[PDB]
Structures are given as structure tokens and as C-alpha cells.
Design an enzyme around this catalytic site. Structure first.
Site, PDB file in Angstrom:
ATOM      1  N   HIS B  99      32.603   0.420  28.023  1.00  0.00           N
ATOM      2  CA  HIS B  99      33.500   1.581  28.151  1.00  0.00           C
ATOM      3  C   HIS B  99      34.216   1.933  26.878  1.00  0.00           C
ATOM      4  CE1 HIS B  99      37.284  -0.837  28.083  1.00  0.00           C
ATOM      5  NE2 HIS B  99      36.512  -1.774  28.604  1.00  0.00           N
ATOM      6  N   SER B 149      28.387   0.653  17.707  1.00  0.00           N
ATOM      7  CA  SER B 149      27.790   1.856  17.146  1.00  0.00           C
ATOM      8  C   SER B 149      27.478   1.722  15.675  1.00  0.00           C
ATOM      9  CB  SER B 149      28.795   2.985  17.279  1.00  0.00           C
ATOM     10  OG  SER B 149      29.327   2.872  18.569  1.00  0.00           O
ATOM     11  N   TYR B 162      37.802   6.007  16.461  1.00  0.00           N
ATOM     12  CA  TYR B 162      36.734   5.334  17.166  1.00  0.00           C
ATOM     13  C   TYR B 162      36.070   4.236  16.310  1.00  0.00           C
ATOM     14  CZ  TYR B 162      31.926   5.164  19.108  1.00  0.00           C
ATOM     15  OH  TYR B 162      30.714   4.770  19.612  1.00  0.00           O
ATOM     16  N   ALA B 164      37.346   2.753  13.611  1.00  0.00           N
ATOM     17  CA  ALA B 164      38.334   1.677  13.493  1.00  0.00           C
ATOM     18  C   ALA B 164      38.157   0.668  14.605  1.00  0.00           C
ATOM     19  CB  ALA B 164      39.726   2.250  13.516  1.00  0.00           C
ATOM     20  N   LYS B 166      35.577   0.133  16.706  1.00  0.00           N
ATOM     21  CA  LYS B 166      34.256  -0.485  16.715  1.00  0.00           C
ATOM     22  C   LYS B 166      34.042  -1.491  15.574  1.00  0.00           C
ATOM     23  CE  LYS B 166      32.439   1.565  20.342  1.00  0.00           C
ATOM     24  NZ  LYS B 166      32.103   0.738  21.550  1.00  0.00           N
ATOM     25  N   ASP B 198      21.315   9.888  24.095  1.00  0.00           N
ATOM     26  CA  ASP B 198      21.415  11.172  24.809  1.00  0.00           C
ATOM     27  C   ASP B 198      22.195  11.129  26.119  1.00  0.00           C
ATOM     28  OD1 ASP B 198      17.942  11.222  26.122  1.00  0.00           O
ATOM     29  OD2 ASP B 198      19.679   9.954  26.612  1.00  0.00           O
ATOM     30  N   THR B 199      23.474  10.763  26.059  1.00  0.00           N
ATOM     31  CA  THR B 199      24.278  10.636  27.254  1.00  0.00           C
ATOM     32  C   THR B 199      24.968  11.961  27.372  1.00  0.00           C
ATOM     33  OG1 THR B 199      26.116   9.664  25.956  1.00  0.00           O
ATOM     34  CG2 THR B 199      24.684   8.123  27.137  1.00  0.00           C
ATOM     35  N   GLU B 200      25.358  12.316  28.600  1.00  0.00           N
ATOM     36  CA  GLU B 200      26.077  13.546  28.899  1.00  0.00           C
ATOM     37  C   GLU B 200      27.155  13.731  27.861  1.00  0.00           C
ATOM     38  OE1 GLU B 200      27.464  13.879  33.180  1.00  0.00           O
ATOM     39  OE2 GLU B 200      25.679  12.725  33.758  1.00  0.00           O
ATOM     40  N   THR B 201      28.143  12.833  27.913  1.00  0.00           N
ATOM     41  CA  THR B 201      29.288  12.760  26.978  1.00  0.00           C
ATOM     42  C   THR B 201      28.976  12.907  25.501  1.00  0.00           C
ATOM     43  OG1 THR B 201      30.078  11.035  28.503  1.00  0.00           O
ATOM     44  CG2 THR B 201      31.418  11.534  26.619  1.00  0.00           C
TER      45      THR B 201
HETATM   46  N1  LIG Z   1      25.947   7.667  23.494  1.00  0.00           N
HETATM   47  C1  LIG Z   1      25.925   7.416  22.190  1.00  0.00           C
HETATM   48  O1  LIG Z   1      25.414   8.355  21.312  1.00  0.00           O
HETATM   49  C2  LIG Z   1      26.484   6.112  21.590  1.00  0.00           C
HETATM   50  C3  LIG Z   1      26.309   5.856  20.243  1.00  0.00           C
HETATM   51  C4  LIG Z   1      26.799   4.676  19.648  1.00  0.00           C
HETATM   52  C5  LIG Z   1      27.436   3.749  20.467  1.00  0.00           C
HETATM   53  N2  LIG Z   1      27.633   4.008  21.802  1.00  0.00           N
HETATM   54  C6  LIG Z   1      28.343   3.027  22.613  1.00  0.00           C
HETATM   55  O2  LIG Z   1      27.713   2.822  23.854  1.00  0.00           O
HETATM   56  C7  LIG Z   1      28.700   2.671  24.872  1.00  0.00           C
HETATM   57  C8  LIG Z   1      28.540   3.723  25.995  1.00  0.00           C
HETATM   58  O3  LIG Z   1      28.776   5.050  25.532  1.00  0.00           O
HETATM   59  P1  LIG Z   1      28.256   6.357  26.470  1.00  0.00           P
HETATM   60  O4  LIG Z   1      27.797   7.401  25.534  1.00  0.00           O
HETATM   61  O5  LIG Z   1      27.438   5.836  27.560  1.00  0.00           O
HETATM   62  O6  LIG Z   1      29.657   6.842  27.060  1.00  0.00           O
HETATM   63  P2  LIG Z   1      30.115   7.652  28.399  1.00  0.00           P
HETATM   64  O7  LIG Z   1      28.899   8.215  28.980  1.00  0.00           O
HETATM   65  O8  LIG Z   1      31.159   8.615  27.982  1.00  0.00           O
HETATM   66  O9  LIG Z   1      30.707   6.486  29.285  1.00  0.00           O
HETATM   67  C9  LIG Z   1      31.969   5.936  29.026  1.00  0.00           C
HETATM   68  C10 LIG Z   1      32.260   5.088  30.274  1.00  0.00           C
HETATM   69  O10 LIG Z   1      33.544   4.477  30.133  1.00  0.00           O
HETATM   70  C11 LIG Z   1      34.424   4.949  31.145  1.00  0.00           C
HETATM   71  N3  LIG Z   1      35.844   5.122  30.689  1.00  0.00           N
HETATM   72  C12 LIG Z   1      36.431   6.125  29.955  1.00  0.00           C
HETATM   73  N4  LIG Z   1      37.742   5.828  29.833  1.00  0.00           N
HETATM   74  C13 LIG Z   1      37.996   4.653  30.463  1.00  0.00           C
HETATM   75  C14 LIG Z   1      39.134   3.875  30.694  1.00  0.00           C
HETATM   76  N5  LIG Z   1      40.336   4.191  30.219  1.00  0.00           N
HETATM   77  N6  LIG Z   1      39.029   2.717  31.420  1.00  0.00           N
HETATM   78  C15 LIG Z   1      37.832   2.283  31.943  1.00  0.00           C
HETATM   79  N7  LIG Z   1      36.733   3.076  31.711  1.00  0.00           N
HETATM   80  C16 LIG Z   1      36.817   4.227  31.023  1.00  0.00           C
HETATM   81  C17 LIG Z   1      33.788   6.252  31.676  1.00  0.00           C
HETATM   82  O11 LIG Z   1      34.111   6.525  33.018  1.00  0.00           O
HETATM   83  P3  LIG Z   1      35.501   7.148  33.566  1.00  0.00           P
HETATM   84  O12 LIG Z   1      35.971   8.323  32.774  1.00  0.00           O
HETATM   85  O13 LIG Z   1      35.164   7.524  34.969  1.00  0.00           O
HETATM   86  O14 LIG Z   1      36.554   6.082  33.610  1.00  0.00           O
HETATM   87  C18 LIG Z   1      32.301   5.917  31.561  1.00  0.00           C
HETATM   88  O15 LIG Z   1      31.905   5.103  32.661  1.00  0.00           O
HETATM   89  C19 LIG Z   1      30.055   2.822  24.200  1.00  0.00           C
HETATM   90  O16 LIG Z   1      30.628   1.581  23.957  1.00  0.00           O
HETATM   91  C20 LIG Z   1      29.741   3.514  22.925  1.00  0.00           C
HETATM   92  O17 LIG Z   1      30.719   3.250  21.969  1.00  0.00           O
HETATM   93  C21 LIG Z   1      27.153   5.172  22.380  1.00  0.00           C
HETATM   94  C1  LIG Z   2      30.012   7.703  21.675  1.00  0.00           C
HETATM   95  C2  LIG Z   2      29.699   8.327  20.323  1.00  0.00           C
HETATM   96  N1  LIG Z   2      29.500   7.278  19.337  1.00  0.00           N
HETATM   97  C3  LIG Z   2      28.863   7.458  18.172  1.00  0.00           C
HETATM   98  N2  LIG Z   2      28.701   6.502  17.340  1.00  0.00           N
HETATM   99  C4  LIG Z   2      28.137   6.871  16.199  1.00  0.00           C
HETATM  100  O1  LIG Z   2      27.930   6.150  15.236  1.00  0.00           O
HETATM  101  C5  LIG Z   2      27.758   8.335  16.205  1.00  0.00           C
HETATM  102  C6  LIG Z   2      28.536   9.076  15.120  1.00  0.00           C
HETATM  103  C7  LIG Z   2      26.248   8.498  15.985  1.00  0.00           C
HETATM  104  F1  LIG Z   2      25.553   7.765  16.825  1.00  0.00           F
HETATM  105  F2  LIG Z   2      25.927   8.091  14.770  1.00  0.00           F
HETATM  106  F3  LIG Z   2      25.885   9.754  16.142  1.00  0.00           F
HETATM  107  S1  LIG Z   2      28.257   8.972  17.781  1.00  0.00           S
HETATM  108  C8  LIG Z   2      30.818   9.230  19.964  1.00  0.00           C
HETATM  109  C9  LIG Z   2      31.898   8.751  19.249  1.00  0.00           C
HETATM  110  C10 LIG Z   2      32.948   9.593  18.930  1.00  0.00           C
HETATM  111  C11 LIG Z   2      32.925  10.924  19.317  1.00  0.00           C
HETATM  112  C12 LIG Z   2      31.838  11.419  20.031  1.00  0.00           C
HETATM  113  C13 LIG Z   2      30.791  10.572  20.353  1.00  0.00           C
HETATM  114  F4  LIG Z   2      29.738  11.070  21.039  1.00  0.00           F
END
Ligand SMILES: NC(=O)c1ccc[n+]([C@@H]2O[C@H](COP(=O)([O-])OP(=O)(O)OC[C@H]3O[C@@H](n4cnc5c(N)ncnc54)[C@H](OP(=O)(O)O)[C@@H]3O)[C@@H](O)[C@H]2O)c1
Ligand SMILES: C[C@H](NC1=NC(=O)[C@@](C)(C(F)(F)F)S1)c1ccccc1F
Ligand SMILES: NC(=O)c1ccc[n+]([C@@H]2O[C@H](COP(=O)([O-])OP(=O)(O)OC[C@H]3O[C@@H](n4cnc5c(N)ncnc54)[C@H](OP(=O)(O)O)[C@@H]3O)[C@@H](O)[C@H]2O)c1
Ligand SMILES: NC(=O)c1ccc[n+]([C@@H]2O[C@H](COP(=O)([O-])OP(=O)(O)OC[C@H]3O[C@@H](n4cnc5c(N)ncnc54)[C@H](OP(=O)(O)O)[C@@H]3O)[C@@H](O)[C@H]2O)c1
Ligand SMILES: NC(=O)c1ccc[n+]([C@@H]2O[C@H](COP(=O)([O-])OP(=O)(O)OC[C@H]3O[C@@H](n4cnc5c(N)ncnc54)[C@H](OP(=O)(O)O)[C@@H]3O)[C@@H](O)[C@H]2O)c1
Ligand SMILES: C[C@H](NC1=NC(=O)[C@@](C)(C(F)(F)F)S1)c1ccccc1F
Ligand SMILES: C[C@H](NC1=NC(=O)[C@@](C)(C(F)(F)F)S1)c1ccccc1F
Ligand SMILES: C[C@H](NC1=NC(=O)[C@@](C)(C(F)(F)F)S1)c1ccccc1F
EC number: 1.1.1.146
Lengths: 263, 262, 254, 254
Positions: B99, B149, B162, B164, B166, B198-201
């Protein structure tokens, strides 16, 4: 162009954790070069001494403001008071850390949190408070960090988390500044073992390796800051300082420097 | 690590916590874990989305599947969530910390609130969840998976707060892994370093700003679990699977090896 | 400790090998325009006269050619003696020629391997040895043209790559020998990706410009750089560097 | 993972097997119960007998100089006849070398290239049909000087670097053409061999690894079909030799 002591002449500088260790040493160098300095730390007694000596050294002016960097109101207010006293600010040296010992992480979440607040969060608060004065002078921000804010070391987990966070935060905003055309440099200092009272009392028990001199350290920090260098490295081992560079990070950053489109 | 190939049977009957498991990578991990026959407890804030995840998990084949909803801004919830989760399954084998706080791309100006919230949600709560779970993980010689990340290994503009948080994860958990080696703790710690997924967010937050190939969340999720089950130190996943060859740091491994005798 | 300007080659005495076509021909043209003395070589007598006349046109201080094959080590040695005589010395030795090669799987072609090693590697050592007295007189420079395939493995170019690797190990070693012995002759190794020469375009992928490639080789040689990198992609050029090798050489230096 | 079982009954050639790492390799192969044919320029007879005392399935020698490419091609056919096939070709021999600044010794550069590199290609070409039949291994012994520049060993370094360029290129040809023969490049730091210790004493201030384990690690690497095998006193060193930027660039496998 090389470093010259005249660069600091009449420069308005803030140094935090300046009552002992590398911070005190930095205050004295700046004093010798005839800068205006405002030093801070918690202890007014030790700060009073740093100030008198700074005056004896030929500082253009020296003063202190005491308080704890656990308090983000103090941090924010201190920078305003310092800046108004000096009539501006050309360099902010962020150096203070919360008291830490070597120990295996147990359950001490309060210490992880205190480390993040004092070593990392206060630095962000101090920077925000200072940026307007620094933008005016095209000044610089110096962030003092560690080998443990670059690699993993046992015994220092809370403290490594907070120094890694510094590199993360400040390296990202340095990129932000270079595209927003903010003429404020950000210098990260990566230090190995330095022979300061507290370091020596903290480590000398467990590990041991050769501690570099605090006085040369302090001077090398100022010069990297003066020369707007991105990173300063300083250790007793030349091996260590060669090894601490990360060329592949540098490669990835250029690689990814194109894949965003900002205004 | 384990000198062997991944097989789904590795997770059958395993007891797993997945945080931020209401959407994105977290939800896909729950589904993968369910398909493999693990016991699952998922958390996030959204009660309603969490219920839907639980239903699909149960029909996917989970030995058992539950949710507990709350905010990881609240360190009392985090600490209690883990206690409650271990009661539901009767112990814990894997803890997946995934999360993050809602964050969007922006130049840093003066949002100290945001820097603070990031450090609390994306870093502090992981420490708190880890303290709570460690006893259970020690009884099972289990694993902690920490999702991170590219921006937690390199600097990236617009994600300063963010990044910071990670970076701090790398620093904290990488140091605890050293400590677990000295004191003979049999709990693996896997740090996952992800490029764009490719997550919604993610897709909404970066649309029109970053211009990169987003990788598939389903495969991403599975690679994370595999990494965790094989007790790897680091897992790298990116669409551009050659980029992942840079992000590993041998100078860092050397300095860690070199200073291991001090 | 400087940056490049064409005037650094004005009045310089420069040998260019493989100068009848491709990159080498471009280098000679660039040098002519910069007002250098140039002695060009290759096998093609009639092509070399044409290169020479156009170098004069362009403003060379002087220009001459000597034709011969670099499979003949005696020619290699005599060529350098005569080039020095025509110029009154030598400031820069640009070693650029290669033997005829195709992309081909390696089966039993020992003769191609040996010939590659002779022309592409050993002739470079013979020319260096012959040129050294003069380059010492002048505090001159050696410029060695190499390839991505001389830094990394590529199928189908096995003999060529053995010869280009050998150049790196031979000229990088003597380069450290020249430091310690205080011989003020610089050694530049140019690592090149695909370049749009007639020969390469037929034999073979984004091709970089030959004219711009040639200048970049000259620049590195003029600035006394250790290695020069040139590819149509900035990404490729970032990666060709090897920091780890630098550390280990830095290490073992004690 | 590795077990001495793996080499029981395997048909192996070891070149330069009359001293140092080569000899030790035959012994290890003997204690493992392998068919050995060993070569060099008498002491081979001593080596062949001691191989029997240690219980090799067979132990033969053929004496010659690898300066002679006819000998090299003939020795392998002969050795292949004696054992009725070949599983592992271990290439280890080098020409006699000294520490010295390169000045004008082209003959040594040429000799090094012939013995250290060209002969290894001759042996491999002759070995390729047999190694194909037995899905075998080629093991090339190289050095720190074959990966990084090192003063005083220019000729040697050129030949070692050339082995890397050549064999890594064919390794990749074998993959894309699905030839099921493995190639192992062994990168050795300083080893306490009788020639190496005499050659580098008073000059290189370095910790020497032992002959015994080096041979075994060499053998294991080739038994295990590993791409490269590093071995040096320094635990330190070996993390830097791997080159990811090379790996990445080769991934213009396209
Ligand atoms: N997607 C990417 O491009 C990407 C890239 C690099 C690293 N990552 C890492 O992969 C992991 C997942 O990212 P994602 O893209 O899957 O994100 P996401 O789809 O936005 O999911 C975030 C999850 O955390 C929950 N959350 C948000 N605020 C919270 C809180 N205060 N307490 C408990 N839960 C909370 C959200 O649900 P609720 O709002 O319902 O609580 C959701 O279940 C993260 O650690 C991210 O840093 C993702
Ligand atoms: C969850 C995601 N994490 C990322 N981590 C990363 O290193 C980024 C810059 C990417 F993967 F390189 F694109 S995006 C994210 C971080 C901050 C803002 C938006 C956002 F989609
Ligand atoms: N010394 C080393 O081996 C070494 C190695 C790597 C990195 N570094 C870095 O270098 C910097 C200086 O370290 P050092 O060893 O010189 O330190 P030191 O001697 O302990 O000095 C620390 C300073 O910070 C102050 N401080 C402590 N708590 C504070 C708080 N809550 N608010 C404000 N100030 C506080 C201290 O004064 P008060 O107690 O009076 O407040 C003191 O002035 C640190 O950033 C450290 O991370 C040092
Ligand atoms: N083009 C590329 O994509 C590329 C890529 C990487 C590296 N490089 C390097 O750049 C350099 C120039 O390459 P190029 O593309 O310009 O090649 P090119 O056009 O084929 O020219 C090669 C030159 O060598 C000469 N030559 C050939 N055989 C010779 C021999 N036996 N003796 C003496 N001279 C001989 C040729 O002229 P004659 O026939 O008249 O003798 C010609 O002048 C080479 O060292 C090459 O390895 C090129
Ligand atoms: N030893 C080290 O510190 C070290 C370091 C890096 C790499 N290496 C590598 O390890 C391998 C073996 O090294 P080493 O130190 O064991 O060398 P060594 O002890 O001197 O053995 C060399 C062998 O090659 C044979 N040989 C010499 N000239 C020959 C020729 N003209 N034709 C056929 N065989 C010939 C020698 O036997 P005869 O004289 O009886 O013919 C001897 O058996 C080499 O590839 C070397 O590059 C060693
Ligand atoms: C201030 C000091 N910082 C260090 N930073 C580092 O990287 C350490 C491990 C050292 F310098 F390498 F020794 S010590 C420190 C941090 C935590 C505990 C003690 C202590 F002295
Ligand atoms: C002169 C050229 N050299 C090259 N060197 C390289 O690294 C190659 C593969 C390329 F530049 F990467 F494409 S091409 C070449 C070598 C062998 C065969 C054809 C040919 F054009
Ligand atoms: C056989 C040895 N090979 C070496 N290979 C290397 O890379 C050297 C420098 C060492 F291993 F680093 F010591 S020594 C060697 C080569 C040339 C001259 C002497 C000599 F001992």
C-alpha cells in the site's frame, strides 16, 4: 574554476548542529573566511562558545539561535529569524541529527519516527523556509549524509532509513529545480567514519575502521557547497570513495530524463 | 535464496497478508495467492472493494480469505490488523507490504503535510507491520516482501515525497536484512523494484506526463510472489527488461561485503 | 584540459590508413580542410590519387599517398619511414584500415581469422613501432579505430571481433606503460557503432553519418582522450563506458 | 550443482598440461576417473603415469609445439582416435612470457598471438565434430589481463583479450544456430604457479591463489557449462568483472 577562500567572504550562511562535531568545524572555517554565520543546536551553552570563537576567527558576524529540530515551528521560525538578522542567505548547511547509538533494531518505532522527523523532515521544513531567500541570492543547499545513506549497514537501521530518504527527496527536487530553472544548487555529502566525539563514543566499541579528521571533512563539505557540486564524497579510504559513485544510477537517470514532458 | 525453480505448490496452505489489496498490484497478488490455495488476509481502506476481492479469492480456490479495513495512517490499526490477521489464519508465512498513500505528479513547493503523510503511510506503517508480524514469521521461518519502485533507487522529478519514502524502505529493510544475518533470524526480506505498471491509479496519475511502456499488473504480481517464495533479496520488474540489469549495484554489494569485517 | 577547435590540426603531420574510402577518406578530407599535412595509404593507387587531389583542393598543407597492402609487415614499416620523410616528422598516427569481411557464421575459416589478426591487429603494432621515435619527437598521438564488436560479443563477426579485442588489450596496456615511463604519446581508442559507409551498409541497425564520425575520431585524437564513442544512439554510447574496468585498473595500479 | 561423478568416463584433452594449472587439471581429472590426453613440448610421461596411479580410465600423451598449426590439428584427430571421441577440450597452454615494457618486440607479439590464440582456434575447429556428437564443452583459460588493461604484459593481454572476443562471439553463434556445445571462459587472477611466481616476483605485489583449487574451479565451471568462471585470491575483485552494460548491449540480440 577551482576553490578559493574568498568565495565565502561576506556570505550569509546557516549551519545546523553547529555546537559540536563537523557542524562546529564548519562554523569555524566559515568564520576564518569572514562569512556571516548563524549557528543552531539545542544547547545554548555550547552555542555561546562556538559564537565567541567564530568572532575571534574573523567571522563578519556570528550568532546563535537555540532550539530542537523536533519542532517544525522552531525550524521554520529559526530560518526567518536567521535570514532577517543577516539580511538574506546564500547557503544553508543541513547537518544536525538526533542522538543515536549502535543497536540491533528491536521494537523501537519511536526512534525510527524521531530519526525521520529530526534527520529528514526538519531538513525539508528548513529548505521550504529558506528557498525564497536562496532564490534571491541564487544560493545553495548542503545536505550532510553518510555511507549508510548509500549502502546497507547493520546497527544503524533507523538512521540509514532517514539518510536514504534525504538522497531520495533532495535528488528528486534537484531534477525538479533544473527544469523549473531555480538557480539553487543542492549538494549531497556522503561521509564515512569521521573522528567526532559522538561518532567515536558510538562506534569505537563495536566496529572499527579509520576515522577521517573532522576538520578536513568540514572543509570538504563547504567546498562542494561553494562549487555547486552535486555530491561530495569523503572517507579515509580512497577505495571507499571510488566505490561510492554510482555510474549506473547516473545512466538510468539520463535514460529516463527524456520520458517525461513538463512545463 | 532457494536454489530451485518456482512452483505454485510452494504457496499451497501458506498464510499470507497482502496490504493495499483492494486494487492494482495488491489485488492481483491476492488472486494469484488464491489460485495457489493459500490462506489470504487482505487490507486497505475500502470495505466495499475489499469484500469483492475476498469473494473472487474464495471462488478462485483460497484455503481461506478475509479482509480487515482500515487506514495505515493509524499506527494502532496497523499493529492490530496484524494481530487480527494472524488469529484468522492461525499464524503467518508471508507478509506483503504494498500500500501507498494517494499521490499524484507535482513539483514540490511547500507541501510538508504530504511529505509527512508519505513517510507515515509508505514507510513508518511498514516498520510497524513488520514489528507486529516478526514473531509469527519467526515461528514459520517466513518472509517479508516490500514493494518499491525505480524512484526508490534513482531520483525522479515530480515524485519527491514518494521517492523519499521508497528510498527509506531500501535503507531500513536492507539494514534489517544485515541484522537478521548477524543474529541468525530465518526470515527473508525481498525488496521489489518496479518500473511503470498499468494499474488504474498509475495510468491516471501519469497520463500525458510520463511517456513509458507500462508493464502488465498480473505478471508483475506473480513475479513479486515468486521473488518472495524463493527468498530473493531483490526482484526487478519492468516492461523494458534490460533496464533491470542496470538497477543492481555491485559497488554497493562490494562496500557491504568490504565493511562486513568491521 | 580543453575543448576542440579545428585549428589544433593546422600544420600537423598526420598519417591516415584505410584512407581510400569510408571513414578514413572522410578523416583525410576533414584534416585537409583543417590545413594539416597528410599522408594517406590503402591498396587502391588510383583512388588514393583522387583523395590526394581533393585534399589539396580543400586546403591541406600537403598531401601524399603511398599504396600497399597491410598484410605485408615490411610495407607497413617502410610506409611509416617514407611518410615521415614526406612530412618532416609525425604528430598523429590514425590507424583505421581493416581487411575485407562479411557477416558469416564461423565454421572452419582459420585463414580468415589469421588474416584478420594480421591486417586488423598486427599491422597496427608494426606501424606504431615504426612511428614511435617520431611521435616521441613531437609528443604526438596514436588513434586506434575500433568497434562495438571490439567491446562486446556479436555473432557472425567472430574473427573481426577477436582482432578488435586484441587492439584494446594491446593499446590499453602500453598506454599504462607510457604513463609510468613518462612517454608523452597519447593513445585514443575509438569505439564505433554502425556507420553509413558503403562497405558496412552492403555487409549488414541505425547507421550514423560517416562525415560526422570521422570528425569525432579526429577530435578525440586532438584532445588526447583515452576512448572515443560514436553511435547513432546516445543510449548505446552511454553504455559502452566501463566504470568497473576503470576501478580494477585503478585498484591493481598498486 | 557439481559432483565428481560428472567427469567419470568423460574423454578430455588438456593442453599445456606438463606444468602448473594444466598439470593439476589432469590430476583432478584422473582422481575423477576420466580419459585424459595431455599435450606439451618427457614430463608428460611423468604426468601420464601419475594419472594412472590416481585411477584414470585411460591416460595418454602426445608431445608437440602449438606453434605448429599442422601439429595442433593432427594432435586432436589423434587424441580423438585414442579415446574414440571427446567431451571436453581444455585450452590452457601459453607461450613463454616475461614482464617487460613493450618497445620493438613484434616477434613476441606475433608468437603470443599464434600460440595463445590462433592455436586455440585450430584446436577448436578440429574438435568441433566430436564435441557436437557428445554435446560437449570448450574451456578457454584466460586472465585478469584479458578483461582489463595491465602494464608489462601487452602481448599476452592482446592474445587473452582476443580469446574473449573470439570465443564469446562464437558462443552466441552456437546459441542462435542451436549447436549444443558450451563455452567457458575462465578469468584467473594471479595463481602461485611455478612460472608465474618466478615471472612476477618483486614486480607484482599481489596475493597468489593456489594451483590446486584453480584447476578444480576451472573443471567445475566447464562441467557446469558456465559462460565465465572467475578465480582470484580476492573475494573483493570478482564482483566487478561481470559487465552488465556488455550484457545489455549484446541484448541487441535482434
Ligand atoms: N503501478 C506502478 O506504476 C508502480 C510503479 C513502481 C512501484 N509501485 C509500487 O507497487 C505498489 C502498488 O502500487 P499500485 O499502483 O498497485 O497502487 P494502487 O492501485 O493505487 O493501490 C494502492 C493500494 O493501497 C491502498 N491505500 C491507499 N491509502 C491507504 C491507506 N492510508 N491505508 C491503507 N491502504 C491504503 C489502496 O486502497 P484504498 O484507497 O481503498 O485504501 C490500494 O489498495 C506500491 O507500493 C507502489 O509504490 C507501483
Ligand atoms: C505508484 C507510482 N510509482 C512510480 N514509481 C516510479 O518510479 C514511477 C515514476 C515510474 F515507474 F518510473 F514511472 S511511477 C506513482 C508514484 C507517484 C505518483 C504517481 C504514481 F503513479
Ligand atoms: N561523525 C561521523 O562518523 C559521520 C559519518 C557519516 C555522516 N555523518 C553526518 O555528519 C553530520 C554531523 O555529525 P557529527 O558526528 O558531527 O555530530 P555530533 O558531533 O553529534 O553533532 C550533532 C549536532 O546536532 C545537534 N542536535 C542533536 N539533536 C538535535 C535536535 N533535536 N535539534 C537540533 N540539533 C540537534 C547537536 O547539538 P545538541 O545536542 O546541543 O542539540 C550537535 O550540535 C550528521 O548529519 C551525520 O549524519 C557523520
Ligand atoms: N562502417 C562501420 O559500420 C564501422 C563500425 C564499427 C567500426 N568501424 C571501424 O572504422 C574503420 C573504417 O571502417 P569503414 O567502414 O570506413 O571501412 P571501409 O570503407 O571498408 O574502408 C576500409 C579501408 O581499409 C582499406 N584496406 C582494406 N584492406 C586493406 C589491406 N589489406 N591493406 C591496406 N588497406 C586495406 C580500404 O581501402 P583499399 O581497398 O583501397 O585497400 C579502405 O580504405 C575500421 O577500422 C572499422 O573497423 C566501422
Ligand atoms: N599462473 C597464473 O598466475 C595465471 C594467471 C592468469 C592466467 N593464467 C592462465 O592459466 C593458464 C596456464 O598458466 P600456468 O601459469 O599454468 O602456465 P605454465 O605453468 O607455465 O604452463 C604452461 C604450459 O604450456 C606449455 N607450453 C609452453 N609453450 C608451448 C608451446 N609452444 N606449445 C605447446 N605447449 C606449450 C608448457 O609445457 P612445455 O614448456 O613443456 O611445452 C606448460 O605445460 C594460461 O592460459 C594462463 O594464461 C595463469
Ligand atoms: C553519525 C554516525 N554515522 C555513520 N554513518 C555511517 O555510514 C557509519 C556507519 C560509518 F561512518 F560508516 F561508520 S557511522 C552514526 C550513525 C548511527 C549510529 C552511530 C553513529 F556514529
Ligand atoms: C566494419 C564493421 N564493424 C562493425 N563493428 C560492429 O560492432 C558492428 C557489428 C556494428 F557497428 F555494431 F554494427 S559492424 C563490420 C565488421 C564485420 C563485418 C561487416 C562490417 F560492416
Ligand atoms: C601467466 C601470467 N598471467 C597473468 N595474468 C594476469 O592478469 C596477471 C598480471 C595477474 F594475474 F594479474 F597476476 S599474471 C603471466 C603473464 C605474462 C607474464 C608473466 C605472467 F606470470
Amino acid at each position: 574554476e577551482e576553490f578559493r577562500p574568498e568565495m565565502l567572504q561576506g556570505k550569509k550562511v546557516i549551519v545546523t548542529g553547529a555546537s559540536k562535531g563537523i557542524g562546529r568545524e564548519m562554523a569555524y572555517h566559515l568564520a576564518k573566511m569572514g562569512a556571516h554565520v548563524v549557528v543552531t543546536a539545542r544547547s545554548k551553552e555550547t552555542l555561546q562558545k562556538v559564537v565567541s570563537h567564530c568572532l575571534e576567527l574573523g567571522a563578519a558576524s556570528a550568532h546563535y539561535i537555540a532550539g530542537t529540530m523536533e519542532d517544525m515551528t522552531f525550524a521554520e521560525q529559526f530560518v526567518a529569524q536567521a535570514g532577517k538578522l543577516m539580511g538574506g542567505l546564500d547557503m544553508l548547511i543541513l547537518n544536525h541529527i538526533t542522538n543515536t547509538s549502535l543497536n540491533l533494531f528491536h521494537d523501537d518505532i519511536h526512534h525510527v519516527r524521531k530519526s525521520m522527523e529530526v534527520n529528514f523532515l526538519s531538513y525539508v521544513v528548513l529548505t521550504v523556509a529558506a528557498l525564497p531567500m536562496l532564490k534571491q541570492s541564487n544560493g545553495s543547499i548542503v545536505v550532510v549524509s553518510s555511507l549508510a545513506g548509500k549502502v546497507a549497514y547493520p546497527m544503524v537501521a533507523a538512521y540509514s532509513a532517514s539518510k536514504f530518504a534525504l538522497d531520495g527527496f533532495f535528488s528528486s527536487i534537484r531534477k525538479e529545480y533544473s527544469v523549473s530553472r531555480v538557480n539553487v544548487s543542492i549538494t549531497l555529502c556522503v561521509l564515512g567514519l569521521i573522528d567526532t566525539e559522538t561518532a567515536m563514543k558510538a562506534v569505537s566499541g563495536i566496529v572499527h575502521m579509520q576515522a577521517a579528521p573532522k576538520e578536513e571533512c568540514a572543509l570538504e563539505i563547504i567546498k562542494g557547497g561553494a562549487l555547486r557540486q552535486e555530491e561530495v564524497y569523503y572517507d579515509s579510504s580512497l577505495w571507499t570513495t571510488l566505490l561510492i559513485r554510482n555510474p549506473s544510477r547516473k545512466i538510468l537517470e539520463f535514460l529516463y530524463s527524456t520520458s517525461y514532458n513538463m512545463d
